[model samples]
Target chain A: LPVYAPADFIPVKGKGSRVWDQQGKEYIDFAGGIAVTALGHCHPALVEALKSQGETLWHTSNVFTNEPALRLGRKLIDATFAERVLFMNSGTEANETAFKLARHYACVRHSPFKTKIIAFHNAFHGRSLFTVSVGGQPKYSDGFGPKPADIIHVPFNDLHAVKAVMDDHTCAVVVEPIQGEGGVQAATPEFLKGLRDLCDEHQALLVFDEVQCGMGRTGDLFAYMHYGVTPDILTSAKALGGGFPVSAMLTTQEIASAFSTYGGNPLACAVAGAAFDIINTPEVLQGIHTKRQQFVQHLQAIDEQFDIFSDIRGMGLLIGAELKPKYKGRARDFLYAGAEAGVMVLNAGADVMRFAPSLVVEEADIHEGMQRFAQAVGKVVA
Target chain B: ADFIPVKGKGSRVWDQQGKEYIDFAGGIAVTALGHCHPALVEALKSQGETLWHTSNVFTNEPALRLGRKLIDATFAERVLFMNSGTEANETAFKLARHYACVRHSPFKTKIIAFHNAFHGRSLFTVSVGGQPKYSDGFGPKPADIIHVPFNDLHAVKAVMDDHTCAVVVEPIQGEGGVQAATPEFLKGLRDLCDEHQALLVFDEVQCGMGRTGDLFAYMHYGVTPDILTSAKALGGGFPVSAMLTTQEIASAFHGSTYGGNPLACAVAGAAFDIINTPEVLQGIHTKRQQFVQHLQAIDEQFDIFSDIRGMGLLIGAELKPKYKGRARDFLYAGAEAGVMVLNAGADVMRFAPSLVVEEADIHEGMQRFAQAVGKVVA
Candidate 1:
């Protein structure tokens, strides 16, 4: 259970973009609970949704469907490229369901031999055995003992590798539009398009894991929409419930019937409905572009002050600042410094300072957070 | 949505059309305190206003409190929270494998489960589950999992060996027609697991949390498993689960990202506080007898049930030869007659209602159910 080396700060209460730790210190939250608190912590709309639905019904299992899940499903269908939606409890579960559905679809519709799955290097799909095997990281998958087979990985943003490996036997290609845990790397438009074409050529499915970069985190409802190359199956989580622990897998109606059991529970859907209402709006989503610009300006100013970052690149609020050679392998130190300076940030791996703040963070809070971050950087440099 | 349930209170639910139905289903035995219990609602509202999530990067106060409470109330040195029953079972399975593989050999990866067992729907869990229908069609399953007949100690002993890392079973199989395990069988399993050095995993996901007249069904049989996975009623209606184990075994497992969020822990803590008390736990036993008496009376009048059996409030009525495979028909009739119920399979009508269901409500619901059964037979 001691897997995480969390900061000493134990956040007890949160409101908007700020959280108060157990010691009563207020810190500007740039982590956003790992890109989960999209509307910030305990947004009033989400609170109202949880409270109201808590009074009505929480769960009915998969044996019976409920109203909130139905409404949320319809809203997701209308807003995205999906005709059907399957609700789940986490991003990992969503990806697991997606992988299973891909294999099931391929075996039933295409050939049983089309069971090979393609993933990208450094991609963090999930922690389940199947998803972890599909995930490119070996550290997480190793020692799990004889993982599910036929899962292959390719380099991100590399079309030649995909083309070389993809075949008629491939069942699906799972990728993140903007890799969240893989150091905030975005997929190239050419690569996405090429993958789509290859999947089409091979009768395989394209699965886009939008758990981190979707839900307006990339200044679009989905990052795939920005690229105009849609996947057959898409996963959404982290921010889908606005920090209430819900996720969803959206696909076509033909493939959605494969799931039964805990797919569309009512409590999660109620909170997801609230998140969708707040996040799918033009006001919240369109405002993300301005926030992104502001964030980039702050990062640029910081880099100018202290040449500690090798690269400043990201989409929307999900930004990553890779450390320069001098400060390499010290992402955890930056996080510690940020905490000491009364700001909370995250590290993607051990070298990139990952910042996935609330999509609706205030301008003043962003500037203040950057000031704290700059002080932390100054300390690290000193 | 087919039913479109708009509102729910104790032991009853109302659809969008304002038609009321007695809730014999109890949200698949999830609503231990019935719908919208004040304590749970208060917990949710308060936690919603305070903090909903902090992920696993920084543990929250509610999570810590819930963990302590779970450890205190159960035979566990430590507890790990998860979002669903499936996740908990998966974590337990992983821990069992890791425990064996670390202490013994990696070849000690074989898992022994009983037939008709319903662990969960995850890829690993479904494979460990005895039902091949769920595990099949998803490609070749992870190897080293074997299933034997339920309540048969010799059958389990025949398959279990030193290579078996874990043996997972349900105290009462909910989906497989609400079958309860015998005390002798459970004791034998505990002895076999001790002899083979295999971890005994009791999946109380459905039969725990006071559904079986105790906090867990294992308590009634005087058998303690090395690992126990609980969910369903743990949150009363909220979505939360916990895997309880010894401190040594707990240290072998990694934590979940969304496991132990503030909101889920807060709500589940409140539900556990209420359910682990004598009033609620003892009430389940009283209610079970009431429910069984009414069901048996109805069965005698209708002559439709071959046998009526269960432990605590989780009752199952097996259909007669004539009504075999018509359990679904009875479920539909009960639904149409303003009572919501469930079926374990094609031949068993499973009645897993609220643990705190009122006596009057149970009588009324059973009366309505009998009327529906008569209508179906007529």
Candidate 2:
């Protein structure tokens, strides 16, 4: 209770990219449920998927596989490096499976000593106890009882710091190609390459937590591809199901062998598979880059008028604007103002206004949402 | 792929290819009101037009309403909502262990489950499941869990010692071949649990929601569990699940970040309102007889079934020795024949058609099923 950032506004309704509050005030949704709504709100495809599948088959327990799950699994495997994929209810569970599989692989093939998970600072894995522990944010994980042992955190994008700590005992290094909730920080190319090399030398697995930046949000099928630094394991969520609650962890054949059960569920896999089939294509992926340009242009125009933003960063649909000094520590105030002006936005911490709109959000919605955001910026500036 | 290509008024789906199929699967037990049922679609459309989810930090009206609804409908005094079945079971199992740890000795961490039972797929729940295939290769499981045969009283008696914290069971096993426990066995388990001070947990994920001709399978046997997990039909195609327990037992579970979510609970409340009615519950019994009679007629013609068992809308046709291990083959044949079917195990062809499936569809589907069985058995 009372865990999320406080907002002075309440959004009562949402269409594709637009929203309405209790006061009948309208706004554009750039937050996308923290990037959960990939196809925007109430996409016809997703609504129809829910209705049709609602009648035929939904959940039969993971014990019995369904046609949708199988089809999704095949399609996912065909699109990525994974030979086998496991499905779970959320990104946290998918990451949990990834960590568990890594540890299991180490315990079996290597030694129990190889169970140390090296993570980066400012990384947001998930809300689960194990994930939060691996996550860089201590505010979320600190009071959650005794955490699972052997999770180590270091500075993100610092190769020497990582190499200095990695050893034969290191089980894996979990990193986000683009840090979403952590001020929209992206991993550097050389740093990722160095981690891969170090993991190869030390026989440790490289885990990419792409829950926030994957599924066409990064203008690529995955952030891993955009960076060109492949990992042993990759976790995807948020937009994976378009709006449905499905998450996936993809890995190589040898790596995936560590998991043997219920990893690829029928319902989640089928829906996620359908999402992947559509979103992974050139049309959806290219559309993301085009929209990113639109977003940048609009934000830049607003910045030109107000001079309130210090810097604009992040890839594709997952963009962020760091507030200038005068507007520091008032990210939520800007969000509230945006809501009032009929726009929905998010704040990574206390200073960065984050925007993760639908990969297919229309150009008009983007322009209007930015115009509303400009109104919020003007109010905060005054 | 419009995904949800075609949805009829109720309990019907048509693929993009224009092939109309009767939905007995109920979206794997999630669609209690059938396909795009007016009530559920209205709820979904209304909620879609309103709010989806604001995470769990803030409580909303729909969640509170549904929680109250659950408390009023079942023995659960408090309720928590999650997005899926696994999350519900994960929360429940964790709560069971935490309750024992917090209230009883830390050594009372043992959980007992039935063999061949399919509890959700979470790491903890799968470990608690009696099926090794689900838990195997996942590495070391959570310790202090024992598995025993279902419908067995003596084995439970042997294991019902002081260290046991909880015993999890499915009143009617859905994935373990649609096997229903005898009243004597259930009563015996209850008696043993009372003697051992262990909590009795029932998984009504599949067998609940009027599937077993009752609101819950536990009701049919006149037994109530200390904790019960419900899903599948809860959201009517939307993703939602719930873990139910008595007021005393419910105090142990910590709030999940997404628990009691407004979107899931609101839709689930809509589903429960329609499915919990006497009309729907009684209709399930009438439909059960219709399904049984049709299945028996098919059995008489094909002689492929070894047994016909299960209650309400959850019916199973156990293949005879001659047709053993071909349950999946027949299901594929059934699908090819334009009538969808499901298998509980290799030997049992399970038909958990919607509680509201029409008699004509059942007859036509069974006729198509007979054809599939004939082709498969030959």
Candidate 3:
């Protein structure tokens, strides 16, 4: 449970990309709650939507249909490859639903022996028992064994490893389009295309876990769309509800007959509905690339000044700064120093300085945050 | 007059047509303080204006405060928060398993569960659940989980052993016909779990948070579990859940990013304060008896009930042999008579209204329910 370490200060309030700590010390925000608060803290539209639905109906279980969920489902189905959609509380739940649906569809449609799932190393899915096993890291997957059996992991972007391990028995090939916690690693276009062919050849569902990198974070409606790769099932979270705790799993209708529950509430769907409209628009979607470039330019400038970053990679706003060989294992230090420098930042690992800022962050605030970040960098180098 | 509820306040709900219905279902035992409880709504608004979530542990004041409240008020030494009961169960089940794997032996991975018990709908939790039908299509389940019949102490004792990491059971089977565990059976499970070195996980997702006339069903039974899960009413309607355990047991788990979302914890904290009080807890029992008496009278006249059971506001009425599998019929009839009720299954009528339901509302709702029951008999 101590997996996540915290800074000393406590944030009391947030507006736009600025957060105020208890001491009234203001800091420019870049973390975006690990890419969960996509619309930034208390965006007027999201707040209005949440309060409006919060007063109307919060939940009634999943016995009957509600207008909010139906409308949200319609939006997802209309806007993507999704023909049917199931909403849940988190990305973990979405993955769970997706994994289960894949397995069931394979078994009922083909054979029960089709239970093996091929995943990638360093892939971060979620914390549930089923999900942790599918996650590539042993630090999390260990001690929680014997894990749900028959899940095989290979190095990220290794198409050969996937082809070698995959066969008729494989039910799903699960991958995060842009692996958020796996050092913000993105899947190569060739690797993803290879996976699609392998899955098609051997009868496996291609599950894209767009939980972190989706929802207009990549300057596209989704990372899959950006790559022009259509997956059989896709999961979305974090920014889906703009921090109201909602996630969605989208799949074709034939695959959906597999099942459902403990899923969306009216309040969650209503808030998500408002977010979908804002993030899916041409202006917000296009602005994401603009914001992403701003952050990229700042990181590039910082690297030039300090010569501390070896590689700056990842797609759109999910930028990763791989520490230079001389600065190996110092990313965590940079994170701490950033907080003290009156800016908020995150790290994907001990080596990669990670930043997943709000998709709609303003250019002026971006400059100010990067200035603080540069100060943090100078302090760290000294 | 339709049941597509568009709005709610206290124990009453209004449909799209603006027609009102007394909510005996309590949104399937989710709306503990009832819909739009003023305190909960105010908390939502108050937290809405402030910080809601940062997904950062250091920025979490509401969550830290809420965790402290749970630790102080209950048997929990530490708490793991999440968004739903399923996630809470997933955390608890994994903790129980992982703890045994690390502290005891890696081979000690078998989980003991009960038949007809509903833990959750996830592949792992569903497999741990008692229903074969629910677990049937979900691929090859997480292995080494054993399901036994509920409340059958001898049956449980036969299966549990050193290999068993946990014995997961709901104190009250809300979906399994609103069945409550016998005190002796529950206590026996405790003994068996101890003898087998297996952790006892009490899933109070449905029966906890003042619905049982106690903070939790384990408290009423005077039995302490190694781990307990609470949800449904934890936030009074807002989506929040928690897995509570002792310090040692909790030290063996991984962290969650959204586990302690500030908005969820703040709302849950407000609801927790009110539910853990004497006024609301006592009111639950008073309301239960009122419901029982009404069901009793209705059964007496129609000869349609074989048994009336369950604890606190979680009331269940089993139909007579002639009316078997007609609980849904009675439920629909109740709705038609301007009241909303729940069916645990096809044969058992369930009522889990607000823990703080008003006396007048209870009386009037029961009258409407009685009219509905009369129509069912005819």
Candidate 4:
């Protein structure tokens, strides 16, 4: 059967922030494999970790724990409000655990009536049947068949709307501190605070789906840290493994106890721990700020060249540019043209061209890539 | 809670006892490089001091490079990485279903699977698995999946239809008594799939990565799958899995936050480069010859074997009628003889020793295993 690909091209090679296909056609990588590549291609440090751990103990499953997992769990516990952590393969699983944890916590505290879940409008959680149902977009969840029950959606950042709907029966409210797939929208400080207070009032857990905007994406180790609103349970992936496949759910000790068996194991813990250690450092956090400035400067230059973007906005490396009215909902065409012009970008939806480049990408690559993007936008949207 | 294995150096593993065991299991076929290989260790140690993960909010070097490496190595034009075999299989299943839904009719969600097959432990993978024991307790499974006898082309042919989006099978069944599918069966399935427009998925999590004396088991059978899931040995035990597909098939599943992490890809890249080579692949073949010859010799003396089967290092020995239902007793006796072995079923003694297991160890272990089999049957 045929598959749905927004782009027709196939990328074959990558080094740092650039990729080349079989034909040796080069493009600056801004898509980051949909935000899985936290470090540029073949990073020596990550390479070394992989090699070192590779030659030693790789995986022991959940039947046995390993040093890497222990250290990683401790590091996560130390860095965040979470007293405990569970490791899984992806953000979807982490969010699933979060949802389960909330339900379990509610079951223990109250009854099944407290199983209601509230998410935001236009939120992207994951691709799992349960998560996709809870996600704001029905396009992904639809046609997959019946979904889990007890999930509700409200307009994001509407305090009154949240207040109107939330009650003691609400089990959890899952949100992205900075929405990535839902179009690079950062949660307002007041909105996040409002959710926290409402959750507290209703005795519900606040779950954060930081699959895209967590792990030092917002000039801090996590977006929640930058916003000063701590969630009871948070799911993080994307950059959690640097470039390895790893995700984690961090929560307080009491909240974490409601987890299923084998939620966290040694192999994932070790690699994720290594990722947290390297990414949470001052140098890396500071690097994100510097990179953001460089991106802003490039976006400004592109704006000057082609008034193609109605709004160029984002925090840190997770940026988005809303296409002008004339170019709305044609982000794919822009990306195609960008690819032809030597840049690889992402389309969040019809109108938003998302740019999530490497945090450690070279300034030259960013500048040259943005120039290529400008050329594509000018050619298509001019 | 116990002191976790602190370090690994090579084929030998040092436990907290400061005692070492020749790592025959290789963490269930993941440590293809034989533990803490210098290149993989160096990759991790070096990456530890530098940047780790930035989430997927950005691009990284190792992931992109690893993606390139996979495309270069296999029939797959594109690669998507994930954390484990379960995730890899889940991604493949989702992609197959989604592709069929979008391209054909939305009702084309039925999946065909083989009997006694072990795909993974996810809710979706388990439901599609042939083993009802593993999938039973998990509530109502995803709808429209049918299972048929493996290596039997007619079973699959009779059940397949346009509603069948895909057929998932292990080219060589790993956890189900190390059964090998005949080349003819695979060819027939391939032709049938082509005729019906159904995707052929090969769960190479165990049989790939030089375990079958080829880079992938499919390569040896002269067949190709629309989608292939690889894990186990891919990371040399670093807990990485990948879904390899054609460009079109690869695009069905949307993005995942941890799909292609840098750390996993770097290690996988190194392991892939080393294990996909003539030295490793050919070495596995040589080791299999040594192992099969030894096991056959042992069986000849005891008259305790019904059959010996499987490919490369993934071998299994079924017991004679006289010794039926005593596989665990043999395993215990082998352990008492200071050799650890596994059992696939009550009748089959499974041996998945390391691909790089020493020739001397195989001889010694088999001699010890021969004694155990004799003692258990005596």
- For A155-242, candidate 3 gives per-residue lDDT tens digits of 9999999999998899999999888888888889999999889999998999999999988888888999988999999999998998
lDDT tens per residue, model 4, A1-382: 1113322344445678877655677888887777767677656666555555555566664544667776787788888898887787778778766776787688777775677889888898876666776799877776643355678888887878888888878888888888787778888889999999999999999999988998887778888988889899999887887666678888887776654223454445555666677788899889888988888887777777777778888788888888888777788788778877988788777888898887788889888898888888788865
Clash pairs detected, candidate 1:
none
Residues A1-382 of candidate 2: C-alpha lDDT, one tens digit per residue: 1224334344455678876555576768898878887877667666665555654544543444556766777776777777777777788788878988888788777885677889988899875556777899886655322355678899988999998888988889999998988899888889999999999999999999989998888989888888778789989887988666778888887876654223344444555666677787899889998999899998889889989788999998999899899888888888878866777788888889899998889999988888888888898787
Estimate, for each residue in B1-378, the C-alpha lDDT of model 4 and write its tens digit.
233455565655566666444445566666666766777776665554443443343435667677777777788888877777877887788888888887787888878898899987655677778998765532335668899998999999999887888889999887887889998999988988888888999999999888888988998998989999999888776667888899787656553222355556767777777877788788888988887887788877888888889888888888899889888888777755556567777888877766777787777777777777677667
Better of 2 and 3 by DockQ: 3
Backbone clash pairs for candidate 3 read none
Look at candidate 2 and tell me the lDDT of residue A45: 65
Task: Give i-RMS (Å) per prediction.
Answer: 1.8, 5.7, 2.0, 5.9
lDDT of 2 by residue, B177-253 (tens): 98999999999988988888888888888888778877888888888888888888888766778888876776654
Greater TM-score among 1 and 4 belongs to 1
Better of 3 and 4 by lDDT: 3
Proportion of native contacts found in each model?
0.60, 0.15, 0.67, 0.25
Chain A TM-score values, per prediction: 0.97, 0.95, 0.97, 0.95
Model 1, CA-based lDDT:
0.86
Each candidate's number of clashing pairs is: 0, 17, 0, 50
Docking band of candidate 3? medium
Residue B24's lDDT in candidate 4: 52
